[PDB]
Design a protein around this ligand. Structure first.
Ligand code: SF4
Lengths: 33, 67, 109, 197, 148, 147, 232, 33, 33, 56, 109, 109, 109
């Protein structure tokens, strides 16, 4: 795995995970993020 | 061959991820039957207090200066 | 059955790799503890050469055990009976013989 | 789960010191809901007034009331999964500032006038230890000084006494466990001896 | 009230840029809110800093890496570190081949491979105030700063 | 050595506080931080907050500036009436925003970095800073157009 | 600019420098414990490191997250230590999980260490050369059979604090018993349940008006015995 | 490193990081996320 | 790629992603995170 | 912002060496993030104001 | 037991790799420090060859330490007795001899 | 000491890999700049063969320098004295001789 | 200097790898475009072998460009002079000769 191409993919997956978690926290209990 | 299970020191600096060295898991990449990155919920679930793990901590109406 | 009753080829590997609790940061002080109670369970990389007809019996045995269901085995290393399981056991079917390549991870339960 | 609510009601109907020399039921209603809040808000208010927590059991929605319960199972390091590092039982603690020692409970007095009275509950022994951490709370159905003081004291006592938590991922037997099951942990590493195998 | 609003507006209009320049082991000297000059040869069109290769106290002269060009008008100054870690300053008299400089006085204790800087009469100092200093568990310190 | 009426300091301070009424907002913040009854004196306490930083801050806040009506006025002054219980961070940020400072844990004391015209402390070139793989010893960034 | 000596400044600018050691001290005196001294390394003679005449014992310990920033959250460092042989465990069950303790961290160049640590001795030994930092323990984040992890915080950390703090109440006293505001110094009278006692260890004010009357302290009562009717 | 097993591990690490970050931003200064 | 050093790098990239995503969700439409 | 200059330095030495205990990767310079709210927020905490109530 | 007695035949590999703290400045300048406080540990990639009967004794000796614990050894490199720990000791079996491979890590403990 | 005074084997590798600032997106235009001032410092993969007795002296020298503390060296490549550091220097100890395999990274400071 | 004069002995490796834009549609259909605007650059994996004295001259010539900068060269493949940049030029030293390996990348600059 080359570093250049891997770091951007990891960053984009991190952004997607942040989206998914923020939207999950706006549910009933959650934290409202 | 094992369960790794990330704790709290591993997520706080690359300290104990190299403690267990994750050699077998890293060289084995993974498996369908077993799941990695379990992320024990000790410290996260107790952040607001122990009493919040037992009761939902009812809220109070917003204070209005008009009163 | 419950006893592997075949004879292994001369060249056989015996890895140990014991499990211990080791604490060390950077290059400073080090602490070592023996972790569990059942020390190291080793691993025997084993090879067999069988005629083409008994390959069926050997693979029927191995497939009946099927990864789980440890069996009794007496390795010619320490000659002491132990309990082992096999998970891969690939085979190479030559013109007149067959070569089994398997692994034995010894267990307790 | 109607039987969980049945036991919860029996617990809430117990007689306890009133503080004025008499007796009083442990927890009581007399709420007047007038503003449309989300169902989660009202459910959390009800489940916080009596110290329970709603969990989907798998067939019914059960409630886990904070009650003195008995041990259901015992787990040693020979019965739990071992990860790469030798930590069958991971432990964690509540923070210094999350251990509150002073609570202001807002109840509604039916004697002076039906207005909000603030009752202050303190643990001076803990204030000498964890600085002084203060919180505010609304006892949902409280109209009796004793019930408000009891809610505040339960919060303070739980924070001061219950401190640590454990993660001890187990084998196939874990299907026997519902949340809110008391279990004993016999960790030979936590102790100085060996007490299981 | 007018002064508070005007300070906000003036700070926003004047102070514009920030810098990250993680440094070596000396970063332990820095508290947040310390003003520091940055002499970046890439930002400028010239070279105005480097290390001192050799010092000759008699016929006082210094050997400097890179090449240094004196300005047509005025006088330039050269900042050296003495033997007590004190950043003394001297006046440049004549640079022969851009590697050999002759100054008014060589400070005592100026060792080789010490840091020298150049101050031209027509160059802004470009000061920045630190806002965050992070230890990198390596010996290097990560410093963030904003225009001053 | 500080007379609040004339807002004039005598000389070297050497500590040794004095119970006098003053409008100096820096010492109002000092009272807020280190008062045991109502403030934050039980937690925190003295010897944790840099008193000399507040001393220089007060001297700066006591300077005379044009009033705008032809007169003069102290640079920054108090006269707040805190009535609603806000978090300690809120009040601390309000105090540290009224005078342009920023509280930072120095390492031994809680110092305040007042926005003042200060002198250069050190000088850094590309021969004194870490070089990463890409040739960017100094990375730069700018504030946005709408900021 | 930190108050650090000129010898450390000279050592920082050198191309080839000595190793920078970090010595840690845990102080639980304010919470009911002792002072422990740790260093991740031994010295060349296989002994605990002697600095300024104090022996810092060998023990695996390492910190991270140490930084000086003002904008944003107050910085929370973290300290990871070895919990083999159940030492930290023993502290956690004893000292309330070490919460409220003080962690002091010293950075020292090895060249300035005491001459004891070296076989040939140290000519440059200078016990004044150190960089000190103080922090508090906020939570023992992890404690397993292998290691322990502690969250550190700046001693200020205005997280749970409010201002102003004193609260207006009726039928309750907000003063600290026998404190300066309470101003009481009399003999034992009663306990928190207003039961008359002559035992000094069972003497505590009930914080109600009757408890104050038991000590003839109603002048110093922290409450306001009129506000309950004005709020109706 | 195989793509299938690595992408889920990265996603879960990202979710955990988002949890830690959302919780740490509700601290004093922070941003309250 | 060794697991120890890679997991911390992934975690830090995820936290930076949370930084960026929360800050970009506090923009006009967004979610205000 | 894009796999543009990660391939600029190409990270070949770090990628093939994975890293080391002493040195740390992924530093994430605080340039743009620290200045997003404005420069004036990097020097003063920007006190807040009470919530507006329509009742007044 | 305490002392390693068996002899290592073919020529071991000795690895030093001292741990240092390094900073890379700009135009070719650097900064170097020894990181640690004491020495360098050094490790021996070592191989034994022993008859099929002494192999049980060798394995028992290497198992009684079990990865942790340190035994004395005098390497045939500098001829000074040191304390080492072994954690792998792989072994390959043959008709008349067993060949062991191990990594002895020198420790101050 | 401050001068490596041993003789290296014939086969020795010299890698250069200069450090430059290169900007290029996709397959479009490319721009190249010489980055730093001290160009490339090269790297010498060096091997030595010394009798079993001088191994101690050579290793004592290398371990005294210990990664930091560059020393003076005159490579037979350009015959010009330079300053280098060594960080690995593994060793293979034959029956009568030993073979050092080390790396020399040329420095400036 | 500008022109590369030393000769390449063994048979180089010439790599083309033109960059294209490719879209894979559904049932076997596709879409292809040349991506760039100006041809393909091509790179030469090249090996020199030169006496121990000319090696210093070769290294000095390759260092004077230092990774960046372009020198003229006429490859013995198409016999048309092109501009190349070299950024590795590893070199292995022998008893009487030095063998250089390099990667010449053709550039329009
Ligand atoms: S009620 Fe009276 S005696 Fe009791 S603490 Fe308050 S002031 Fe003191």
């Amino acid at each position: 795995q080359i570093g250049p191409a891997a770091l951007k993919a990891v960053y984009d997956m991190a952004r997607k995970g942040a989206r998914d978690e923020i939207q999950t926290q706006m549910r009933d209990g959650g934290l409202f993020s | 061959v094992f369960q790794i299970v990330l704790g709290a020191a591993a997520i706080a600096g690359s300290f104990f991820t190299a403690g267990a060295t994750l050699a077998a898991w890293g060289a084995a990449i993974g498996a369908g039957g077993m799941t990695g990155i379990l992320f024990s919920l000790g410290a996260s679930m107790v952040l607001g207090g122990v009493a919040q793990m037992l009761a939902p901590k009812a809220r109070t109406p917003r204070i209005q200066t008009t009163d | 059955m419950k006893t592997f009753r075949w004879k292994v080829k001369p060249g056989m590997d015996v890895a140990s790799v014991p499990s211990v609790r080791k604490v060390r940061f950077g290059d400073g002080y080090s602490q070592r503890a023996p972790a569990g109670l059942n020390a190291n369970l080793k691993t025997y990389s084993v090879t067999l050469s069988v005629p083409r007809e008994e390959a069926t019996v050997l693979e029927s045995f191995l497939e009946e055990h099927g990864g789980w269901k440890s069996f009794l085995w007496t390795p010619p290393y320490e000659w002491r009976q132990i309990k082992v399981t096999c998970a891969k056991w690939s085979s190479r079917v030559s013109m007149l013989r067959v070569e089994f390549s398997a692994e034995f991870e010894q267990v307790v339960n | 789960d109607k039987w969980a609510l049945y036991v919860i009601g029996q617990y809430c109907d117990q007689s306890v010191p009133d503080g004025f020399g008499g007796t009083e039921p442990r927890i009581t209603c007399n709420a007047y809901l007038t503003t449309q809040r989300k169902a989660w808000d009202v459910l959390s208010d009800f489940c916080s007034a009596m110290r329970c927590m709603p969990v989907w059991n798998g067939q019914t929605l059960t409630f886990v009331q904070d009650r003195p319960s008995d041990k259901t199972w015992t787990y040693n390091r020979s019965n739990v999964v071992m990860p790469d590092d030798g930590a069958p039982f991971r432990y964690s603690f509540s923070a210094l500032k999350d251990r509150h020692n002073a609570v202001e409970v807002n109840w509604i007095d039916p004697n002076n006038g039906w207005e909000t009275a603030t009752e202050l509950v303190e643990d001076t022994q803990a204030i000498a230890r964890y600085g002084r951490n203060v919180t505010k709370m609304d006892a949902f159905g409280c109209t009796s000084r004793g019930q408000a003081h009891r809610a505040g004291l339960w919060l303070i006592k739980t924070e001061l006494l219950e401190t640590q938590t454990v993660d001890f991922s187990v084998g196939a037997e874990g299907l026997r466990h519902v949340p809110g099951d008391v279990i004993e942990i016999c960790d030979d590493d936590y102790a100085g001896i060996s007490t299981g195998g | 009230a007018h002064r508070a609003g005007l300070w906000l507006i003036k700070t926003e209009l004047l102070e514009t840029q920030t810098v990250d320049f993680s440094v070596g082991a000396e970063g332990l000297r820095h508290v947040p809110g310390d003003v520091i000059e940055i002499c970046d040869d890439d930002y400028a069109g010239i070279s105005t800093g480097g290390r001192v290769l050799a010092v000759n106290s008699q016929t006082r002269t210094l050997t400097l890496d890179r090449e240094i060009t004196l300005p047509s008008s005025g006088t330039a100054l050269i900042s050296l570190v003495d033997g007590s870690g004190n950043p003394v300053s001297v006046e440049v008299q004549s640079v022969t081949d851009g590697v050999k400089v002759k100054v008014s006085r060589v400070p005592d204790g100026v060792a080789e491979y010490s840091v020298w800087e150049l101050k031209l009469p027509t160059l802004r100092q470009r000061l920045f105030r630190c806002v965050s200093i992070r230890e990198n568990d390596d010996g290097t310190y990560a410093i963030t700063a904003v225009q001053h | 050595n500080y007379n609040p009426q004339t807002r004039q300091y005598s000389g070297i301070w050497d500590g040794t506080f004095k119970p006098a009424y003053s409008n100096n907002m820096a010492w109002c913040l000092w009272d807020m931080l280190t008062h045991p009854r109502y403030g934050m004196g039980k937690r925190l306490g003295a010897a944790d907050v840099d008193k000399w930083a507040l001393y220089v801050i007060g001297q700066y806040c006591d300077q005379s500036v044009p009033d705008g009506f032809g007169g003069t006025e102290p640079r920054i002054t108090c006269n707040a009436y805190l009535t609603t219980q806000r978090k300690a961070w809120d009040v601390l940020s309000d105090f540290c925003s009224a005078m342009r400072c920023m509280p930072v844990w120095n390492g031994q004391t809680l110092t305040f970095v007042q926005d003042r015209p200060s002198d250069k402390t050190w000088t850094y070139n590309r021969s004194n800073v870490v070089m990463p793989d890409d040739g960017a010893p100094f990375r730069y960034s700018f504030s946005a157009l709408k900021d | 600019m930190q108050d650090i000596r000129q010898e450390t400044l000279n050592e920082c600018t050198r191309a080839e420098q000595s190793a920078s050691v970090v010595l840690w001290e845990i102080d639980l005196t304010e919470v009911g414990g002792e002072r422990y001294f740790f260093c991740n390394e031994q010295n060349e003679k296989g002994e605990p490191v002697t600095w300024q005449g104090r022996q810092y014992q060998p023990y695996p310990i390492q910190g991270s997250g140490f930084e000086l920033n003002g904008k944003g959250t107050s910085t929370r460092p973290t300290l990871t230590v070895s919990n083999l042989y159940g030492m930290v465990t023993g502290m956690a069950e004893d000292m309330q999980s070490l919460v409220g303790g003080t962690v002091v961290r010293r950075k020292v160049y090895a060249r300035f260490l005491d001459a004891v640590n070296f076989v040939n001795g140290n000519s440059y030994a200078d016990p004044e050369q150190e960089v000190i930092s103080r922090w508090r323990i906020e939570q023992c984040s992890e404690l397993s059979a292998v290691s322990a992890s502690f969250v550190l915080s700046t001693p200020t950390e205005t997280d749970g604090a409010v201002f102003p703090g004193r609260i207006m109440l009726a039928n309750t006293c907000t003063w600290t018993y026998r404190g300066d505001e309470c101003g009481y110094s009399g003999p034992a009278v009663a306990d928190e349940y207003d039961q008359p006692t002559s035992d000094i260890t069972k003497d505590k004010c009930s914080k109600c008006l009757s408890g104050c009357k038991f000590r003839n302290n109603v002048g110093n009562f922290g409450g306001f015995l009129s506000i309950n009717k004005l709020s109706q």
